[PDB]
Design an enzyme around this catalytic site. Structure first.
Site, mmCIF file in Angstrom:
data_model
loop_
_atom_site.group_PDB
_atom_site.id
_atom_site.type_symbol
_atom_site.label_atom_id
_atom_site.label_comp_id
_atom_site.label_asym_id
_atom_site.label_seq_id
_atom_site.Cartn_x
_atom_site.Cartn_y
_atom_site.Cartn_z
ATOM 1 N N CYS B 114 0.792 -1.226 0.000
ATOM 2 C CA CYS B 114 0.000 0.000 0.000
ATOM 3 C C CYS B 114 0.835 1.292 0.000
ATOM 4 C CB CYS B 114 -0.942 -0.030 1.214
ATOM 5 S SG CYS B 114 -1.385 -1.706 1.819
ATOM 6 N N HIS B 264 -3.890 6.585 -0.291
ATOM 7 C CA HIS B 264 -4.130 5.178 -0.569
ATOM 8 C C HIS B 264 -5.604 4.847 -0.310
ATOM 9 C CE1 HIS B 264 -4.259 0.877 -0.274
ATOM 10 N NE2 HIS B 264 -4.410 0.917 1.037
ATOM 11 N N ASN B 294 -9.714 -1.873 -3.252
ATOM 12 C CA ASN B 294 -8.346 -1.641 -2.813
ATOM 13 C C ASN B 294 -7.392 -2.456 -3.678
ATOM 14 O OD1 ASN B 294 -5.860 -1.557 -1.491
ATOM 15 N ND2 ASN B 294 -6.754 -1.664 0.573
#
Lengths: 337, 337
Positions: B114, B264, B294
């Protein structure tokens, strides 16, 4: 700021794999033959549950104990390895914590093999000279032993496990201490040095666990390392001298200015062939892997450490470092040590 | 030379995983419950034999077709991924060849999740501004789908597969287009987002294949992804606002001078909590993962691409990029787009 190599420390695991043990295991490879073909007498092997990251941990501890740099100073960690702890998280992240490095430090893993140290230096220099870090801890660590088939003689005579830690720091001066660089990548060489099964291109299967004996009597599976030695040698002879010449031409550097040509320590046979082609005298061309073997990304820093120990490396020396292998991948740089 | 973002292209695989399909699999999680908790309606999933590198290949092809850069111009490839083709060789090496990039290009893989895009930008900037490269191809790609347990609802509702390609090029000018940076690493967070078994710390075994159901009804094994949601949220709330403040202090700029805070894209709940703590206006805080979920290291560049498509990102805008997650690892940077 200018990036410079502050200090280097190596670490080899405890277990020794001698030519005598290999010769007992392989009737067709006596100790005298192994030494003549490779120049390697011993390799070190990681303990069964000891990982590359564990070896890097020890290398870093040794570096800090040498007193040029401490954990508190480190503000970036780069771990070059081809045997990480997990798919995720990143092994360098755990090393930050294990080593007591501050949480403001950056940390990441790089996947490269025998070219890894020079590429690592390029990244470290980039971070330092753009002000992103003042003290980069560049770690190399491999445990190729973990994916060598016990009866694959072609690779067990060559590879050793090991690690290193290098501190790349911000330095004041009007001299480039690391650089310039040349780079190379040729993905066509992928099949010639590969662990085919075990990750996401080819998950492990019944097929990948099947043993096959080749025409040279070597046994392996697709879950183990495969090395086409003839191809890797041809690649090295084709690209390494060319890279060295490119680098000197790029730098506008007289060839005579190079005090030491430090090459990835593939084996004595490969190194001798390269030395002859490159027309470099022996005293400028170290061969220092007799007791550690080919330690992959760690070959260059371990060689530099050995050079300091045997009195052949000193501050002010002009070096060319050359890494080359799995990928295919290669890189060269000049260093004012 | 100064490093700048020349262009970005994203790629998502074809297979769509909808909330309706997840509701059929998970009776306890109707489509409305999934949407309320995550803000995600659809994710994209790589084909069974399609790897992260395959997705990055498509992202790069798309980038070249956009016409700001071509394969012939690329002189360094960085692939950020947590699902590589092999343990060795490096996946970026094969991508060099597949994409028809010259053999004089550098290439390496980075293992980060991430936080990967921001760290990637720091490396690319370093290479460009030290003259090691004039055109860095920064690729991000993940296939988290390949290690999610079919019955782990907490993760399958969150993660999508995807890739991106960014060209970081040398520019002439008296302006920092990328930077400065802040970094963070906390390896104590390792157990909170982890695939424990399958590599070298814990090779697969009978125990690692054992299924266990947690108190929330999620099933997994040690060979699949584990995410401690509460811990990751606490980490994010503790470190991200602080990182942003550090970055602004380092830059000597007021938070009002930032046109967009691109974080993010963890999920809507996390992003909302961060937005309120950081006291940022909605118009400066994009939430753009409803249809891709995600995508790990690809979240930031995919968000930036989405912003260009919806007209909320333009040249000259001052951005803060913030990446945070697995490691623990985080990083922030300013960008003059």
């Amino acid at each position: 700021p200018r990036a410079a190599i502050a200090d280097i420390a190596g670490h080899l695991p405890e277990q020794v794999l001698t030519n005598d043990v290999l010769a007992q295991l392989y009737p067709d490879w006596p100790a005298e033959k192994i030494l003549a073909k490779t120049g390697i007498r011993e390799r070190r092997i990681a303990a069964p549950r000891e990982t590359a990251a564990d070896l890097a941990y020890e290398a870093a501890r040794k570096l800090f104990a040498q007193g040029a740099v401490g954990a508190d100073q480190v503000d970036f960690v780069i771990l070059c390895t081809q045997a990480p702890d997990y798919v995720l998280p990143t092994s360098a992240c755990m090393l930050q914590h294990r080593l007591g490095i501050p949480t403001h430090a950056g940390a990441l893993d790089v996947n490269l093999g025998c070219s890894g140290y020079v590429y690592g230096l390029s990244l470290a220099k980039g971070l330092v000279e753009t002000g992103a870090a003042r003290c980069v801890l560049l770690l190399t660590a491999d445990t190729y032993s973990k994916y060598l088939h016990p009866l694959d003689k072609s690779v067990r005579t060559l590879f050793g496990d090991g690690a290193s830690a290098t501190a790349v720091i911000a330095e004041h001066g009007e001299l480039e201490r690391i650089g310039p660089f040349v780079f190379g990548t040729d993905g066509r060489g992928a099949p010639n040095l590969i662990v085919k099964a075990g990750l996401f291109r080819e998950p492990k299967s019944a097929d990948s666990a099947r043993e096959h004996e080749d025409a040279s009597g070597n046994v392996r599976t697709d879950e183990h390392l495969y090395m086409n030695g003839a191809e890797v040698m041809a690649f090295s002879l084709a690209e390494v001298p060319r890279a060295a010449d490119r680098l000197l031409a790029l730098a506008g550097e007289p060839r005579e200015n190079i005090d030491c040509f430090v090459l990835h320590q593939a084996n004595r046979f490969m190194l001798d062939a390269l030395r002859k082609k490159m027309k470099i005298p022996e005293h400028k061309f170290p061969v220092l892997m007799e007791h550690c073997g080919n330690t992959v990304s760690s070959t260059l820093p371990l060689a530099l450490e050995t050079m300091r120990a045997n009195g052949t490396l000193a501050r002010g020396m002009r070096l060319m470092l050359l890494g080359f292998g799995v990928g295919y991948s290669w890189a060269g740089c000049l260093v004012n040590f």
